[PDB]
Design a binder for this molecule. Structure first.
Ligand SMILES: Cc1nc(C(=O)N2CCCC2)c(C)s1
Ligand SMILES: Cc1nc(C(=O)N2CCCC2)c(C)s1
Ligand SMILES: [Cl-]
Ligand SMILES: [Mg+2]
Ligand SMILES: [Mg+2]
Ligand SMILES: [Mg+2]
Ligand SMILES: [Mg+2]
Lengths: 194, 194
């Protein structure tokens, strides 16, 4: 019933643009929305986010997260490792590449979501969520070598999966950070399960 | 180590603005970013809420109540947690219970409320509280629940069993063009992984 009539460019930056979207509401009344898009997309999705499950025998299973200064937020954020998909890169390949660059871990693909939306009332941005396991007992993951590209400055934080939500809440209390909504949602469901 | 140096307005709409952000990198080098922000944030601890609504009924499996709506930024239908912006002076909890009733008809009971969490922190400063609400589906109030959508809100309610959430989302995505929200997907994935 609903659909886009037209899109007017408001402002285009290098990396982001702002549009005025004209759409038909279900009643046949025309309405407008203000919408954000990235200028970088081709591709399945703008990006990937990796859920990295670090598995070491005789240890609690951990979820590997990253902490970074985020200029839009004006502060530090705790997130899944993540980046944009290169032109002609598959989402699986982007996940393994970003996971290594940001954490130094080398992982295996467990599963890969369809394109999911980041903030659909605001932007068209989408990602694929990629669950990856990291055999933490392999030699290649003994001393994880992170390969940060230009301007990336990433701290790695591994938290136990079985208490993820209490651990995150504790970092927020102590360290003045913003947890990512996807990280939080995952953590919540771990507790809400069963 | 890192901090904001300046925020230069590039373009302001009615609802969203684009900024040129200048920040200090941890090597002591000045860099720039492009940042999205809403124009509607006041003294709220976040822009918005999203509601995790757990529908509970005797002799039923627990459902997660979701909503499907057309999203002009995406140009299509999206399946999401019930959500909306927090009104000036309104608490995140009150906003959650109000949005849940408006969008689904249900009258919930607060269970938990997250700290403010970031929606897409490499892009925007937008934040929400994730509010877990239980719905007593045996209460007569929640028997024949009628949405009270505000002007231009057009919302369908989709209740799915918690114990099969990911597969049930996959089956909806198999049957039409629709995008699942990344927070919904993260939550469904954790329900599987636990
Ligand atoms: C980025 C956008 N957000 C909204 C929105 O959700 N609004 C609901 C209350 C005021 C505006 C647009 C109408 S455009
Ligand atoms: C909204 C923005 N996103 C990025 C980003 O993550 N980029 C990674 C490759 C292209 C730029 C900015 C540098 S500004
Ligand atoms: Cl797993
Ligand atoms: Mg990244
Ligand atoms: Mg990276
Ligand atoms: Mg809403
Ligand atoms: Mg609403």
């Amino acid at each position: 019933k609903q659909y886009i009539i037209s899109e007017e460019l408001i402002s285009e930056g290098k990396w982001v643009k702002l549009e005025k979207t004209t759409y038909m509401d279900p009643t046949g009344k025309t309405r407008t929305w203000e919408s954000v898009k990235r200028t970088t997309r081709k591709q399945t999705a703008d990006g990937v986010a990796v859920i990295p499950v670090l598995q070491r025998t005789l240890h609690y299973e951990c979820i590997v997260l990253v902490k970074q200064f985020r200029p839009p937020m004006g502060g530090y954020c705790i997130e899944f490792p993540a980046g944009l998909i290169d032109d002609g890169e598959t989402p699986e390949a982007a996940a393994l590449r970003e996971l290594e660059e940001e954490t130094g871990y080398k992982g295996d693909i467990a599963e890969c979501s369809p394109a999911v939306c980041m903030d659909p009332g605001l932007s068209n941005c989408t990602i694929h969520i990629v669950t990856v396991t990291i055999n933490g007992d392999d030699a290649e993951n003994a001393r994880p070598k992170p390969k940060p590209g230009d301007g990336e400055f990433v701290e790695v934080i591994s938290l136990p999966k079985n208490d993820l939500l209490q651990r995150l809440d504790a970092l927020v209390a102590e360290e003045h950070l913003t947890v990512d909504a996807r990280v939080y949602s995952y953590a919540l469901a771990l507790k809400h399960a069963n």
